[PDB]
Design a binder for this molecule. Structure first.
Ligand SMILES: Nc1ncnc2c1ncn2[C@@H]1O[C@H](COP(=O)(O)OP(=O)(O)OP(=O)(O)O)[C@@H](O)[C@H]1O
Ligand SMILES: Nc1ncnc2c1ncn2[C@@H]1O[C@H](COP(=O)(O)OP(=O)(O)OP(=O)(O)O)[C@@H](O)[C@H]1O
Ligand SMILES: NC(=[NH2+])NCCC[C@H](N)C(=O)O
Ligand SMILES: NC(=[NH2+])NCCC[C@H](N)C(=O)O
Ligand SMILES: [Mg+2]
Ligand SMILES: [Mg+2]
Lengths: 240, 214, 215, 240
């Protein structure tokens, strides 16, 4: 399903990924943590090719997607992404944000799209906001809407790039809960987060990254209670 | 002699005729410069390297080079080819061309000003570049561009005074006319300045207000 | 007739002379326009209402009104007062005044552009507005200002072509001179435009390059 | 020492402070908490008059400072302020950042100032950065440098406006530690923070603000375990 194979990424002289490998299968919840600038988000963003590796390859469902020999749109249809800064469409209403892509990408019938959308709004607790514009929403509301929007394309895996890090503290739980609910429903997920509670509670697997490399990984209990590596223990001691 | 503004009053219709001419000149020039400008920008977005090159060269040359020289190049420089284009078509052409380059830049920059997150989200949801552009990016780019077009017009009002030197009967030319009958240059020039100023203020208020409305 | 750029070659000393004159004009005006501009800005910062009012009115009127009209106002408009100021001093005066307004704005904005936190920290440490200004804000405003001054100059090169209509022998005026002896307007205008372009590119390259070192 | 008396603040149509009163005596560590937009930082900034109350008065050392009948600079000499976004002077080296105000405001001799600065740098663990420029420092180092700088003016109270909110997680502790040390040394402090651990560890008093009002206050354990008010409870439940 997801196979990132020995990738490197550089932005100019800045080396960000230095040979990283990640495999994730259906139903896993994989959580990536580590100090700032360690490359977490860049790895995440290689998976749906919002970043292009300098070397190495990324395969989805067994087909290489960074060889220029594939339709990248169909790929991104399967691989959803939730952004730290929401990236809601400001000129579109809540429902419209949700239904835009199904109607334009999948060619869904509009009544059907509207019904999908109301279901998703109802799920993330935003039904009474269906005709509001993003501006009128709180951070929590914005991220919940974005999540609904990504779910509307019914992807097989959801990527979350630090989805609560730009939220006020009173606003974090409500997004994390929605994330947890998705995990409890078997959604395959790769989450980059600074919220260790989420990793502990619903991660099936936790990846610790430092200086552009994966330095240790294992189950939540392994990383948070029995970490073998020194860098891991250090990071955790500063964070917890 | 000594200053006499009251003597100037009877010449009101000439100022008004000049003012009206600056407007007509500028509206028409900017209007054409926008349509042309949109077209030029589209070319610079073309993947076909020669075309992007041509649009880039066009823009660079026109913006890096004086409007006056372009005017004279059209008016004077074309005579020797058996061309006798009026002062008006010369002016409109020059201004529309100059304006077209500046507008092409305005457009490119209005697009570049929408947060890249919008495009990223659009694509991440499976939308192609075309769909992201039509449904997400362009509608926002436009709201960036309109106020800078509005500002382009205001700048071109001042710019248009330059067709006076070519003998076009704009607002600035009037001062020659009046002095030929009054021997006074100062007073009609002051009056002309006042008019340009009031025009500038008026349109600045109006645009800003429209801007405040977006 | 038909185009003949070779015939134009012999007029090189005129082109070069026009160029040097465009340089001389723009430099002097911009230089004066800066000193004036600085002075105008200081006035707009005065707490004394009349002075700030005058600086604002000066700035607003000059920027909100065509350079041509200012040129002619000085040149033609002063004659009836028994004034016969040369083309050079007319151009220099007009350009320096115009530039003074735009430069005044540039300064105000270079100051407004340093993060207000800097002033907040300066003042929080007990510093007066004056001390905060001298040791913290102005040194940074300056780095905001220098690149926009450099840009003003580049713009003024193009702008100065307008003293040709007053009969000053700048780079643009040459096309008249040359045509008087060749009956050709086209080719010398192309050549002059080209010179303006190359000048624009040269100074643009330098300036940005200057900006990067600065920041 | 500090007496904020029934103050109000509006930014245009936005009512931020709606009648707030705060008293702090020498040696207290007061911590202000609450949901975003409740007015915490604005209250904080009324104390050294970086904001001006629309109504109400603020007295420091028993003299009113928002009636224009005082030398405000000398007031701010006594009341230090530490900023969320550091506000280091970029063109000045570390030592220069520190010694700037004493030399120019207090007229201290340059050698004396230099010695003060090296003591403070050693204290906050930044001695090896004395000649470095802010651009070369990490977030933690920046905030510790700003703290050294404020201390160099030897104030009688220190104000902290969310001093770790812009720090990466691995970077929070080192700043909090410096703060705690100051608390253990009797420094009078008013801290607006999202880090409840600081209040727990060294706070004398916790102030809870909601919608431009102080709705509840008490000792940290009172607020964190026995909050009387419903808003306090709601906020804490989204936050703890
Ligand atoms: N498109 C880009 N162009 C240039 N540089 C980039 C780009 N994207 C990321 N970077 C830089 O690459 C580095 C790695 O950033 P990344 O976000 O992957 O790290 P991270 O471990 O997720 O950090 P954090 O926990 O702070 O989000 C950062 O310095 C970032 O600023
Ligand atoms: N100088 C100012 N001008 C205009 N608006 C301001 C100013 N200072 C603060 N505000 C606004 O007043 C409101 C109150 O902000 P304040 O920082 O006091 O709340 P807060 O409780 O500190 O919130 P947070 O915990 O999110 O920082 C904010 O919406 C802010 O945007
Ligand atoms: N369309 C425009 N905004 N043109 C600006 C022209 C600026 C200057 N007068 C020149 O001729 O170079
Ligand atoms: N100093 C300047 N940048 N002046 C710009 C002048 C713009 C325009 N040509 C006018 O006369 O209004
Ligand atoms: Mg990141
Ligand atoms: Mg705040």
């Amino acid at each position: 399903m997801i196979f990132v194979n020995d990738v490197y990424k550089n932005f100019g002289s800045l080396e960000v990924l230095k040979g990283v490998t990640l495999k994730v299968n259906k139903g896993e919840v994989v959580v990536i943590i580590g100090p700032s600038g360690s490359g977490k988000s860049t790895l995440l963003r290689c998976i749906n090719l919002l970043e292009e590796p300098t070397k190495g390859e990324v395969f989805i469902d067994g087909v290489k997607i960074n060889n220029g020999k594939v339709n990248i749109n169909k790929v991104r249809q399967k691989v959803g992404m939730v952004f730290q800064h929401f990236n809601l469409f400001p000129h579109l209403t809540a429902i419209e944000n949700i239904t835009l892509a199904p109607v334009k990408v999948k060619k869904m019938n509009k009544k059907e799209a509207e019904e999908l959308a109301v279901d998703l709004l109802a799920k993330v607790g935003l039904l009474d906001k269906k005709d509001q514009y993003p501006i009128k929403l709180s951070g929590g509301q914005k991220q919940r809407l974005a999540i609904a929007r990504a779910l509307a394309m019914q992807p097989e895996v959801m990527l979350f790039d630090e989805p609560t890090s730009a939220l006020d503290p009173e606003m974090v739980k409500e997004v994390l809960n929605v994330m947890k609910q998705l995990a409890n429903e078997g959604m395959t997920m790769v989450v980059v987060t600074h919220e260790m509670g989420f990793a502990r509670e619903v991660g099936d697997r936790v990846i610790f990254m430092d200086d552009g490399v994966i330095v240790e990984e294992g189950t939540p209990e392994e990383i948070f209670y029995r970490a073998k590596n020194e860098r891991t223990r250090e990071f955790l001691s500063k964070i917890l | 002699m000594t200053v006499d503004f009251l003597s100037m009053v009877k010449y009101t219709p000439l100022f008004i005729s000049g003012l009206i001419m600056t407007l007509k000149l500028t509206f028409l020039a900017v209007t054409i410069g926008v349509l042309m400008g949109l077209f030029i920008a589209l070319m610079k977005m073309s993947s076909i390297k020669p075309i992007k090159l041509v649009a880039s060269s066009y823009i660079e040359v026109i913006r890096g080079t004086p409007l006056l020289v372009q005017l004279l190049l059209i008016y004077n420089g074309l005579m020797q080819f058996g061309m006798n284009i009026p002062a008006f078509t010369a002016g409109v052409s020059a201004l529309a061309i100059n304006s077209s380059a500046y507008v092409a830049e305005i457009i490119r920059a209005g697009i570049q000003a929408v947060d890249p997150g919008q495009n990223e989200a659009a694509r991440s949801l499976g939308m192609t570049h075309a769909m992201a552009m039509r449904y997400v990016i362009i509608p926002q780019a436009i709201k960036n561009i309109l106020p800078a077009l509005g500002n382009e017009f205001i700048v071109m009002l001042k710019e248009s005074a330059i067709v006076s030197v070519i003998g076009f009967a704009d607002l600035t030319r009037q001062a020659d006319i009046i002095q030929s009958v009054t021997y006074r240059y100062f007073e009609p020039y002051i009056i002309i300045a006042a008019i340009y100023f009031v025009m500038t203020l008026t349109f600045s208020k109006l645009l800003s207000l429209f801007e405040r409305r977006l």
